[PDB]
Structures are given as structure tokens and as C-alpha cells.
Amino acid sequence: ALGKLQDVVNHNAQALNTLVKQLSSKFGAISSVLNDIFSRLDPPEAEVQ
Amino acid sequence: PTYGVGHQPYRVVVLSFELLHAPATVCGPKKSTNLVKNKCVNFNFNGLK
Amino acid sequence: VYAWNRKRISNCVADYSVLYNLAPFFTFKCYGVSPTKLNDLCFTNVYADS
Numbered sequence A: 001a002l003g004k005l006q007d008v009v010n011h012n013a014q015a016l017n018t019l020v021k022q023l024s025s026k027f028g029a030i031s032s033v034l035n036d037i038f039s040r041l042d043p044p045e046a047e048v049q
Numbered sequence B: 001p002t003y004g005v006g007h008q009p010y011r012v013v014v015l016s017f018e019l020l021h022a023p024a025t026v027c028g029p030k031k032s033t034n035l036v037k038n039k040c041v042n043f044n045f046n047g048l049k
Numbered sequence C: 001v002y003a004w005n006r007k008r009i010s011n012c013v014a015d016y017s018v019l020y021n022l023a024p025f026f027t028f029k030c031y032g033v034s035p036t037k038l039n040d041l042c043f044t045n046v047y048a049d050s
Helices: A004-024 A034-039 A043-048
Strands: C006-009 C046-049
16 A cells, blocks of 8 residues: 555665675675775776776 | 797796685785774774674 | 705794895895885795695
């Protein structure tokens, strides 16, 4: 019965679940953790990654 | 021992690292400190900063 | 060449600063993490070939 109200709640929840999961997606880099890149790389080349 | 350096013997040693989520066995010469729990501080456990 | 050795080292402290004071190694092209920032880095399994 109350389906139109759960629609806007599930959409905002799904929007925040897909946004938080994009942090685990390597956008062509060596990894997804920033601290791992900054530590295991020299400053000049770490900028590109 | 007559040619220039284009064909001279070159001793090559390649070190293949893994760097994955596993119990680390080969660390570096970095020392250790005392563990402080109830404080927001900078931690570095086996490279994970 | 075709019989390249592989001596896997494990459970030991690796100080890569010793390799700098050795014979001139003008091929230290670390296709990987970092040539310099390497001592402060723990590894799991390192396979050294020759």
C-alpha cells in the first residue's frame, strides 16, 4: 500500500550504496587505497597514479 | 672481451614481489614502537598506513 | 638463460640499502612500487630470479 514512499527511500539508499562501492573500483590505477599508493611510490610517478 | 657494450654479459636478477593480503614474512629494517589503543594516532601495520 | 634459478626467500629482514653500495647497478628500473621507498615496506613472498 505504502509503495510510493518506499520508492524514494530505496532510491536514496541505492544511490548511497553505489556511490560507496565506487571507492573499491580501480580507475586504471595500481590499487584503490590512497595510502598504499603514496607509500609504495616515488612522488613524481605517484602523481600520475 | 672485444666488443663494445652492446653484447657484453649482463647478470640480471629480478625480484618478484606479491604484495597481497597475507601474513607478511619479508619486512624491512624499520623499527617498532609501543601500541597505544585509546587515541586517534597514525598507525602502520605491515605497510597499511 | 633457459635455466634461470629461483631462490625464494622468506621470514627474514630485507635491507635493500646494501645493494646500493655494491658494484654499479645502472639498470635499477623498478617496474613496480618504488626504487627508493622500499625499505619501509613489508612483503609476503619475494621470488628472486637470476
